[PDB]
Design a protein around this nucleic acid. Structure first.
Ligand code: CA
Ligand code: MG
Ligand code: MG
Length: 430
DNA sequence: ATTTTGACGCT
């Protein structure tokens, strides 16, 4: 009752660039705009692996992870842009730099947590308070929310998508109590106004469109963001949670898409997030551990406390390459040459990072996979990263991994290596 | 033969 927390203390948004690598390539090459197109890495093996797909091409069934040759079977007019290749490997610099463009714009509005190359959480609580004080009891016009969906509306006593969107927004705004500045629904609504402004600024200043979710925590904001894509934003209120979760597969909630969510489904014999409400906190802790159990107990009620962390920059800078099938590295010279390629890309990115961001990495992590091992990484070792020098870093990585070679032959490497991975970590201010 | 990333939890 009067003491039960409701998780309505913050306004949190999640902003997600639509088909991001595709938009970067479409901005650069106008011939690709408004066409079925995809971004592909490499080209020799089956036309290359697709890593991003425009919504026009998704309509044909083209997906990420698909080989371009197969996608062309679904979509014969599919246009393709290739990721740059440098030093023998795919090089993602263009997309990292485009990401910085967008994150710097978002940071003008509020504190952001970089969640991936194309998405960030936004803590809007303070910005909403200030905007509410500026408004001075003035109602919020639908014109301030031209791309916003209110999840769960319209309801109760038009057959077009935009007409439905507007009907629901009208019902929401008609019900709103705009004179209580502490009202969580009003706070979410002002948050959505700010996110419309943020998304307009991103599009004006970069050309890139994005979607967004606005709710009271990160998990609900992330879920909301996916409800109406592309180029739209969705407000998920606390009150919408019971209906939304009542048919929501557990795997759709962030962190439950893998083994833990599978165990929740199997052990409890349920399918939907809302079904979790029927268990006590102790029951859930008994099955899934103290932390996970408490988290699930709160989350199925719409409540999550994970903070938006103030972190706009990645914590690690890494470079990796797979060597599948017959290309697995089987000689020492091969291993050393590719460690050098990876180390040279790493040195370039690290020097740029030091100049831009006033920090230096202090640890070098070396990871390899051996042929036959099902795990993505077979071995991980660390060593000191004391100089931004590619020859030193590659020599050090070889030193820490050279004892993995079973081969009694000096020149040969066995078992063959199917993956090399160098990662700079443990940054310190510089 | 997806590939190339990135963050965080466990012990
Ligand atoms: Ca995206
Ligand atoms: Mg995606
Ligand atoms: Mg994303």
């Amino acid at each position: 009752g009067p003491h039960m927390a409701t998780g309505q203390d913050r306004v949190v948004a999640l902003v997600d660039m639509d088909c991001f690598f595709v938009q970067v390539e479409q901005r650069q090459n106008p011939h690709l705009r408004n066409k079925p197109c995809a971004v592909v890495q490499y080209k020799s093996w089956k036309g290359g692996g697709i890593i991003a797909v425009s919504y026009e091409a998704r309509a044909f069934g083209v997906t990420r992870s698909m080989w371009a040759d197969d996608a062309k079977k679904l979509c014969p007019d599919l246009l393709l842009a290739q990721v740059r290749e440098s030093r023998g490997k795919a090089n993602l610099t263009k997309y990292r730099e485009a990401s910085v463009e967008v994150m710097e714009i978002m940071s003008r509005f509020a504190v952001i947590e970089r969640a991936a190359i194309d998405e960030a959480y936004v803590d809007l609580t303070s910005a909403v308070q200030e905007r509410l004080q500026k408004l001075q009891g003035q109602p919020i016009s639908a014109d301030l929310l031209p791309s916003t969906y209110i999840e769960g509306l319209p309801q109760g006593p038009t057959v077009q998508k935009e007409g439905m969107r507007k009907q629901g927004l009208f019902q929401w705004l008609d019900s709103l109590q705009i004179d209580n500045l502490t009202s969580p629904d009003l706070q979410l609504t002002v948050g959505a106004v700010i996110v419309e402004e943020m998304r307009a600024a991103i599009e004006r200043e970069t050309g890139f469109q994005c979607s967004a979710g606005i709710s009271h925590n990160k998990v609900l904001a992330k879920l909301a963001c996916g409800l109406n894509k592309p180029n739209r934003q969705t407000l998920v209120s606390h009150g919408s949670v019971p209906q939304l979760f009542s048919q929501m597969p557990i795997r759709k909630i962030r962190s439950l898409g893998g083994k833990l969510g599978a165990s929740v489904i199997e052990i409890l014999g349920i399918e939907y997030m809302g079904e979790l409400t029927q268990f006590t906190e102790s029951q859930l802790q008994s099955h899934f551990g103290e932390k996970n159990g408490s988290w699930l107990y709160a989350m199925c009620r719409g409540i999550e406390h994970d903070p938006v962390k103030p972190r706009q920059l990645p914590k690690t800078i890494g470079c990796s390459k797979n060597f599948p099938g017959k290309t697995a590295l089987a000689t020492r010279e091969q291993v050393q040459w590719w460690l050098l390629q990876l180390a040279q890309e790493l040195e370039e990115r690290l020097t740029k990072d030091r100049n831009d961001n006033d920090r230096v990495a202090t640890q070098l992590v070396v990871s390899i996979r051996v042929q036959g091992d099902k795990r993505l990484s077979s071995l991980r070792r660390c060593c000191a990263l004391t100089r931004y020098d590619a020859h030193k870093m590659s020599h050090d990585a070889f030193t820490v991994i050279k004892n993995c070679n079973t081969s009694g032959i000096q020149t040969e490497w066995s078992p063959p290596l199917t993956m090399l991975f160098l990662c700079a970590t443990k940054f310190s201010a510089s």
